[PDB]
């Protein structure tokens, strides 16, 4: 949902930039003013939706100025148009702040996920309550991997999650082989995490191997 | 509201650490388990209140393990106690993530505030709608300065904000002298912003000067 907004907002700002540049300081076109206003209003909506407060404030500020400009309360001139460009650039900088946001964020995830895998490992090695715990730890890793676009990690965890959902509810019967496959999945997920930790790409061979094994179990346990 | 939680949570984690260390692996005390649980539950509440999701997840995980331990579903041993210490450390690391969070955040503020001062400047130099705009720009700077503990910047902006509130509503009559005091306040606020930008302390002489002048106007306009 975030990236759709970022792609649209970038496009809108590129449109805003051209319309601002096409403004006639002595006699501005209310149609170009309306275009800049529409693009700013669209960005405001998204910024509010996702809690992009710095962007929200930057947009409100341009909106206000534009509302005076398009209604005729503000006298336009070169200086004012330059201010509008700076507000547009501020909106761009704020958008990029929220678009960016990593490192401290990546590290907190890497550290958190490392710990959750240890918890999963031990609970496997040890009850519906524990199955609910392994399930939720996998659910977090999947969710978080989805957040960072870690497609390979997300998929591995998702396949194990579905098996853990059937295990916790009581739809699927568990045994030593199944548990060892879950432990093997844990090891693969750690390597997937480590590859991303080192800004490398996870092992495709391991991914295909574990996903075949997890889907095999989804059939075998039924 | 944030710092009260951070101070309490730090204390709770220090308590948790001692109770975990005082656990008897062969025959644990349900009272020490309850203490660790209470401290974890308290931290969970705050984490939920402020949207500290990474912390929330780290706490849920310890909570779950502790609920098995205190109820007797989990067999304790040295390894399990070490895992509890790691979960406690994770909770500490997550707390510190949310406690920290700056730089990219400081820079976005510095850049945003720089632009808002320019907008304020020009609108002063130029209507209740514009007075509402200068007011809100000051309101943002005050709010944001409050967020970063910039007491001197917050106070300067707050005093001007109250004057801007009376100006926008129509309680206070404005003139050239008042506007020039507002422009002078803008210059002081920029220097206050710049001092913090360079990790320096704002000018105390300017602060006292402008606050006397702003309070003088609060009396003079009435």
PDB file of N, CA, C and O in Angstrom, chain B residues 34 36 56 63 83:
ATOM      1  N   UNK B  34       6.300 -14.329  38.746  1.00  0.00           N
ATOM      2  CA  UNK B  34       5.218 -13.353  38.756  1.00  0.00           C
ATOM      3  C   UNK B  34       5.742 -11.954  38.671  1.00  0.00           C
ATOM      4  O   UNK B  34       5.147 -11.149  37.962  1.00  0.00           O
ATOM      5  N   UNK B  36       8.677 -11.034  37.222  1.00  0.00           N
ATOM      6  CA  UNK B  36       9.163 -10.863  35.854  1.00  0.00           C
ATOM      7  C   UNK B  36       7.976 -10.654  34.916  1.00  0.00           C
ATOM      8  O   UNK B  36       8.009  -9.803  34.027  1.00  0.00           O
ATOM      9  N   UNK B  56       6.582  -4.395  21.502  1.00  0.00           N
ATOM     10  CA  UNK B  56       5.329  -5.126  21.734  1.00  0.00           C
ATOM     11  C   UNK B  56       5.526  -6.609  21.445  1.00  0.00           C
ATOM     12  O   UNK B  56       5.193  -7.444  22.279  1.00  0.00           O
ATOM     13  N   UNK B  63       6.392 -12.738  27.585  1.00  0.00           N
ATOM     14  CA  UNK B  63       5.149 -12.939  28.315  1.00  0.00           C
ATOM     15  C   UNK B  63       4.679 -14.337  28.179  1.00  0.00           C
ATOM     16  O   UNK B  63       4.468 -14.972  29.192  1.00  0.00           O
ATOM     17  N   UNK B  83      17.761 -17.955  27.648  1.00  0.00           N
ATOM     18  CA  UNK B  83      16.849 -17.478  26.611  1.00  0.00           C
ATOM     19  C   UNK B  83      16.031 -16.293  27.153  1.00  0.00           C
ATOM     20  O   UNK B  83      15.863 -15.296  26.449  1.00  0.00           O
TER      21      UNK B  83
END
